[PDB]
Every structure is written in C-alpha cells, then in structure tokens.
Amino acid sequence: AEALFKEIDVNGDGAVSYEEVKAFVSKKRAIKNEQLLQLIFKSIDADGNGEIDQNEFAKFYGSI
Amino acid sequence: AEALFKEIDVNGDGAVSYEEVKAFVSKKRAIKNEQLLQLIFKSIDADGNGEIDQNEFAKFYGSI
Amino acid sequence: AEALFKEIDVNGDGAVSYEEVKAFVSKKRAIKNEQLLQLIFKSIDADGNGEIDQNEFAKFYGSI
Numbered sequence: 001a002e003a004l005f006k007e008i009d010v011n012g013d014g015a016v017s018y019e020e021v022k023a024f025v026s027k028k029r030a031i032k033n034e035q036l037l038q039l040i041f042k043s044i045d046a047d048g049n050g051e052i053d054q055n056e057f058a059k060f061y062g063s064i
Numbered sequence: 065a066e067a068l069f070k071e072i073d074v075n076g077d078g079a080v081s082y083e084e085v086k087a088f089v090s091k092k093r094a095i096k097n098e099q100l101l102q103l104i105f106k107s108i109d110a111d112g113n114g115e116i117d118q119n120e121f122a123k124f125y126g127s128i
Numbered sequence: 129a130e131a132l133f134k135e136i137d138v139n140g141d142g143a144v145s146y147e148e149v150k151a152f153v154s155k156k157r158a159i160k161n162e163q164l165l166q167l168i169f170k171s172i173d174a175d176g177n178g179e180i181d182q183n184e185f186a187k188f189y190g191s192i
C-alpha cells in the first residue's frame with residue numbers, strides 16, 4: 001500500500017508538496033513519450049534486431 | 065501604457081526581436097502550466113494547508 | 129538517395145538506433161515550432177524590417 005504516494009513523495013517526509021507534484025507530472029509525461037516512441041520504433045524495426053536498417057527505413061518512409 | 069511591449073522587449077532597445085518573441089511565448093507557456101498545476105494541486109489539497117497528505121491523496125487517486 | 133536516412137543516422141554506422149530516432153523527432157518538433165513562430169513574427173513585422181516596433185505591436189495586440 002501507498003506505493004504511488006511514496007513515489008511522488010520524493011523526499012520521504014510523508015507529505016506531498018507542489019514541487020513533487022510538478023516533478024511527478026513531468027516524469028509521467030516523459031515516460032508516455034518514451035513509450036509511444038518505443039512502440040513506433042518497435043514497429044519500424046521489422047526484423048526486431050534493435051536497429052533500423054535502410055531496408056526497414058525505406059519500407060517506412062515510403063509509406064507517407 | 066506599453067507595459068506588455070516593455071515586458072517582451074527584454075533588452076529595452078525599443079524594438080521587439082524574434083528572440084524576445086520566442087522567449088516570451090516560452091515564458092507564457094510555462095506560466096499557464098504553473099497555473100493549471102497549481103489549481104489542480106489546490107483542489108487535491110483539501111484542508112488547504114500547503115501539503116498533500118495520504119488521506120487527501122487517497123481521496124484523489126481513488127477517483128480514477 | 130538515402131539523404132533522410134543519413135540525417136537521422138547521426139553517428140554514420142549505417143543503422144538507425146532508438147537514440148537517433150528520439151533525437152530526430154525532437155529536432156523536427158523544434159523546427160516546426162521555429163517555423164510557426166517565424167511565420168507569426170513575419171506577420172506582425174508589417175514593414176518587414178526585422179524588428180517589431182510599438183506601432184506594429186499595437187496593431188497586433190489591439191486585435192485580441
């Protein structure tokens with residue numbers, strides 16, 4: 001229990017401040033970004049080998 | 065008069081440049097953000113004592 | 129040929145990584161921003177002399 005509260009409560013004083021709220025929401029925004037991008041990258045990386053080669057890029061760019 | 069113009073005219077040369085425009089719009093974006101966040105924080109801080117405790121957080125998190 | 133691929137492929141190893149994708153999309157976001165702002169600035173800079181004076185600013189601010 002209270003896992004989320006502890007995670008926003010960055011200094012662990014048992015209270016959530018405005019700074020920590022601000023910082024949490026920044027953190028969350030960036031993660032959702034990390035995760036959209038990683039999903040898109042996932043999709044273009046056809047052979048799923050971790051890099052995008054000219055063939056995979058071409059297949060993608062050539063669809064827009 | 066000219067208060068806004070003076071505020072964007074950061075170097076005070078009597079002309080507004082592209083840099084200053086760019087910087088003003090950044091500034092404004094951040095303030096509107098500061099103010100949405102502060103309003104939201106305001107709303108979760110039920111007892112309005114400046115910090116969010118586990119009871120106030122729980123009341124909030126438990127509504128989504 | 130492959131101009132775009134070379135441009136995202138920042139380290140030139142012939143493969144596009146997740147970092148480079150991330151960085152490209154940041155770059156693109158900022159350019160579209162640079163270009164909206166520059167177009168807006170363009171429009172307020174009536175005499176198109178590169179700075180915005182109080183008369184041009186007034187004409188603009190006084191339309192909102």
Ligand SMILES: [Ca+2]
Nearest residue numbers: 009013015016
């Ligand atoms: Ca705290």
Ligand SMILES: [Ca+2]
Nearest residue numbers: 047049051053
């Ligand atoms: Ca691949």
Ligand SMILES: [Ca+2]
Nearest residue numbers: 073077079080
């Ligand atoms: Ca100036």
Ligand SMILES: [Ca+2]
Nearest residue numbers: 111113115117
């Ligand atoms: Ca409180």
Ligand SMILES: [Ca+2]
Nearest residue numbers: 137141143144
């Ligand atoms: Ca590379």
Ligand SMILES: [Ca+2]
Nearest residue numbers: 175177179181
């Ligand atoms: Ca001008």
